[PDB]
Structure 1
Amino acid sequence: MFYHISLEHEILLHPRYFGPNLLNTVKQKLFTEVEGTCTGKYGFVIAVTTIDNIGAGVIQPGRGFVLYPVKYKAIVFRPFKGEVVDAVVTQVNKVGLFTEIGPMSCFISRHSIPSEMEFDPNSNPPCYKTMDEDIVIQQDDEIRLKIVGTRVDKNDIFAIGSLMDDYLGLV
């Protein structure tokens, strides 16, 4: 879920970057470091909104690098298990249904799908209709879900959805 928190980061700056463009360079160097990454503590960070303040540049003795502890205000995406969210169906397969929750994707097997939504591989589009073929749930549909499990894979989040709860379908 998208959130807004004030996070911090300390970046080391090479001496040649000194001069009138110094603080401008500090900002421009922070920008391209922490965007679109993910962590096991705060989760996926979407983008940085504003930079709170630059710390005082501590000249590291021995090397020319000066490190600036800079606090920033960014919007972060961390899903939790049991949250009910909306997503778009990306692929329908007999092995399972693939969705996409923003920067993270999930997957739903037939086990999590009650027997109503039966396979449709004979039709050109793989969908999951019912015996009467009224509720047709195919690719590219805003189908809600419930994250029943979270998993981060080397700075890449991967939750797992389900379809066991009622009112999980077309709005």
Structure 2
Amino acid sequence: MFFIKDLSLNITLHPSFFGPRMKQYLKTKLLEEVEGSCTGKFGYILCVLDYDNIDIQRGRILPTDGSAEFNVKYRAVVFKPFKGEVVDGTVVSCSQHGFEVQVGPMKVFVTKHLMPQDLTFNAGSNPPSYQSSEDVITIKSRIRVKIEGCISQVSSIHAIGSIKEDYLGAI
């Protein structure tokens, strides 16, 4: 879910970049390393605001290697869900065990035990989908999934959701 947060990072600048243009190198390093990353403490790093207003701190030369470490604070827009969240998304792949829904930059999987029995798997259809009396769900179909759990690793967060209750499926 999109939110604005205050973030900080420690960036090490190599001694070979020690010149009058160090601020430019720091800005390039920050933009090239932070944007698009994922942190389990704050979710995916989507965007950074006020690029011209980057805050900086005085260097502190490390005693072992000579690389100057800097502390940079900024404000960023990030995405992270919570337990019990309901989100609309796009069906990615269809399987017999369930389905996968892309929401934002993340994937939420639903197992066949997590939908009502009225939705039946049709493999002969192109592409294979889930068909019911009222709702049909397939590729590029907007589907609402109630996220139940999330697993966070260094570079990504996976999710598992359920649509077992009513008012779920095609919109």
Q: Which amino acid aligns with 2:67?
A: F
1:50 Cα shift?
Answer: 3.2
Which residue of structure 1 lines up, in the alignment, with residue 25 of structure 2?
25
Stretches of 4+ aligned residues off by more than 4 angstroms: none
Task: Give the match for residue 112 of structure 1.
Answer: 114
Other-structure match for 2:96: 94
Matched residue of 1:25: which SS? helix
The number of residues matched between the two structures is: 169
- Structure 1 residue 62: Cα displacement: 4.8
Q: Who is 1:56 aligned against? A: 58
**CA-based RMSD:** 1.7
- For residue 162 of structure 2, give the secondary structure of its aligned residue in structure 1: coil
Percent of counterpart pairs with the same letter? 43
TM-score relative to the length of structure 2? 0.90
1:48-76: CA deviation from partner (whole Å, max 9, x where unpaired): 22354101112233532211111021111
CA 1:14–1:135: 2 relative to 1, 3 Å: closer
Instruction: Write 1 or 2 for the structure with the bigger share of strand.
Output: 2
Aligned to 1:162: 162
Q: Which runs of 5+ in 1 are unaligned?
A: none
Flag the 1:22–1:72 CA change in 2: closer, same or farther, 3 A: same
Partner of 1:38: 38
Structure 1 length normalisation: TM-score?
0.90
Q: Deviations over 1:111-145 (max 9, x none)?
A: 10111111111223212112x5x432222111011
User: Which residue does the alignment assign to 1:123?
Assistant: 125
